[PDB]
């Protein structure tokens, strides 16, 4: 179940890239790995930056993308060559072209292997390409939201999670996290003004999944009740799981 201290692992900062696209994903004493990405419809483009923190250059810098078989059927990644020599204090760029074929839950693994000071260096970090990155936000009037909310048919399409807040509850931050996640934040739809409501469409090559979400805070309990209602059970499950970790 993914045990052990999450420090010096392949995912120490993964969660920091679910609601935003840029920042430092990884950093040891030799290498800094930064990111930027953009997505549109079921496609994306991610730039990975490799910074050499030393006064010595790296040789045979080889970054490779690894996807389990299951992930390869749902997510198509293509990349261009990367300068294999990185000067000390210098940075090199890698471009990853992304095509989402169908919804996916696993994450690609980025493996970095290079030479430094006459030694072999290897690093593996989970790449933050996640399902919500293919969101198309959909603004809509209150009445339209409720009509759609009430069109869910198979209970497997609704997924609910009542969890403990990992972060101080804060209205603006919460709004910011929902917007960053990808869906539209619909103001004043829930009659309870303390709740948040979102809506968007997840885009993939083979199917477009309509998505609705309700987030309910409980200050006393320091918990939230998050509900995902979408047109595909696996999408509800992955979005709920991803979103729950952000609060």
């Amino acid at each position: 179940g993914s045990p052990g201290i999450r420090l010096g692992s392949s995912e120490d900062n993964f969660a920091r890239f679910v609601c935003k696209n840029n920042g430092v994903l990884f950093e040891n004493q030799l290498l800094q790995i930064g990111l930027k990405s953009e997505f549109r419809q079921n496609l994306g483009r991610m730039f990975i930056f490799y910074g050499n923190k030393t006064s010595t250059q790296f040789l045979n810098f080889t970054p490779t993308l690894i996807c389990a078989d299951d992930l390869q059927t749902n997510l198509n990644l293509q990349t261009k060559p990367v300068d294999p020599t990185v000067d000390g204090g210098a940075q090199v760029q890698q471009v990853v072209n992304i095509e989402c074929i169908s919804d996916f839950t696993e994450a690609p693994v980025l493996n970095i292997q290079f030479r430094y000071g006459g030694t072999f260096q290897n690093v593996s970090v989970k790449l933050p390409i996640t399902l919500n990155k293919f969101f198309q936000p959909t603004e809509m009037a209150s009445q339209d939201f409720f009509q759609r909310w009430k069109q869910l048919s198979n209970p497997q399409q609704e997924v609910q999670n009542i969890f403990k807040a990992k972060h101080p509850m804060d209205t603006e931050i919460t709004k910011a996290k929902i917007i960053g996640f990808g869906s539209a934040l619909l103001e004043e739809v829930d009659p309870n003004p303390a709740n948040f409501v979102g809506a968007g469409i997840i885009h993939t090559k083979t199917t477009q999944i309509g998505c609705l979400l309700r987030l309910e805070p409980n200050l006393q309990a320091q918990m939230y009740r998050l509900t995902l209602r979408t047109s595909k059970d696996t999408v509800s499950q992955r979005l709920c799981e991803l979103l729950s970790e952000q609060f």
């Binding site: 920091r16 696209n21 840029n22 920042g23 800094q32 930064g34 990111l35 930027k36 930056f49 910074g51």
Partner: peptide
């Protein structure tokens, strides 16, 4: 544009 190193 946003800084790849700012996050």
């Amino acid at each position: 544009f946003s800084d790849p190193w700012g996050g």
